[PDB]
Amino acid sequence: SNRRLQQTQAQVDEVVDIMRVNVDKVLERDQKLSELDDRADALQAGASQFETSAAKLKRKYW
Amino acid sequence: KLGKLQYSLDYDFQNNQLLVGIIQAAELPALDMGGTSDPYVKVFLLPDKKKKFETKVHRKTLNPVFNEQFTFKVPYSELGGKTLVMAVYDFDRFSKHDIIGEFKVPMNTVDFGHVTEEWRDLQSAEKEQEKLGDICFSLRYVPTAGKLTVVILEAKNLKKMDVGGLSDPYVKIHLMQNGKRLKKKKTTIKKNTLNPYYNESFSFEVPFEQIQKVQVVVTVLDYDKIGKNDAIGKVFVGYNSTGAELRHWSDMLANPRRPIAQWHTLQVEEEVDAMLAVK
């Protein structure tokens, strides 16, 4: 019964076509996550600086 | 401890048939009144239990001599993956004939070409768990919001429930406390499958102050339209749980804001419900 063989083959091909797209989307996710990582590091750096300045200002105007 | 068994084995290539000879047995334990049992040996091909051969019943001897022969019309190609079973039975006129011993011989260990004939020690026949099915799911609990996320992933090697075919499994989840069934959930019904895949998430409202007093009951059942729907297996995790279940629970607790997936072995509903009626 070649019908089942070829049908299963078509299933496999379909799932492959799904998975490669999924993989590319995952790569895009890796890019976005990397940039978010850099942005977060910069964010916490600025946060610490602003915290220090806030300490100075509290020790000034109170 | 029952005794030994002398038998003969060889293959006739001219007729393409297996020649199994039952020579005798020795030092058999006595189970009857007179101090001696009434032994008889049942011999059949191990692979398929069809057309089993039985010897004549010898009266009151712990060293019976049968010297009988049996022929299994089996090709030589099929023979290699076929095993031989020789079990010694005790005859009783007014009750079930108790099995004295048994012996299994793999046909891949057997060497044909020279006529084989040997003594082998008898062993006690096997009476393991019947279900042999498993269910895998993930547990996630974050203590702050009190959310319990039970994601039914997938079951495997489930017991057949339908006649001459696979089963129609579905997962029912109960949440119990002090013997009472609070919440009721279920999944989609996957039809005709040996290994059902669901990947379905459920959430429950469980406070942090009662986390050590809750029961999570996962049940895999079979679905027929007509009549009562039977049950394949069930396992429970949480309060009064033991084994890998309590382990998975403790992993859920030790790892918050994170889901831990694990497999579990299905138990009979009687014992489980008996455990849930405790305290």
């Binding site: - | 895998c136 993930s138 997938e154 994170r258 889901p259």
Partner: protein, 73 residues
């Protein structure tokens, strides 16, 4: 020629058989890899949610700080 032919046919049969067995093993590995992948997706998802709540909190706090600095100036 004939014997070698029959043996060839049976050979191809066996080869195809063990091939299908290899397929079963491969789709099993694929299956499990997929499952653990989904698990990772759930975990990282909840982590992303916590990140979002973090961002919201930061926004509100800095809004208040902006208010105080505008009240000081």
């Amino acid at each position: 020629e004939l014997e070698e032919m029959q043996r060839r046919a049976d050979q191809l049969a066996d080869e195809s058989l063990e091939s299908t067995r290899r397929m079963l093993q491969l789709v099993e590995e694929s299956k499990d890899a997929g499952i653990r992948t989904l698990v990772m997706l759930d975990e990282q998802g909840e982590q992303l949610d916590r990140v979002e709540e973090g961002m919201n909190h930061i926004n509100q706090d800095m809004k208040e700080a902006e208010k105080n600095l505008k009240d000081l100036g």
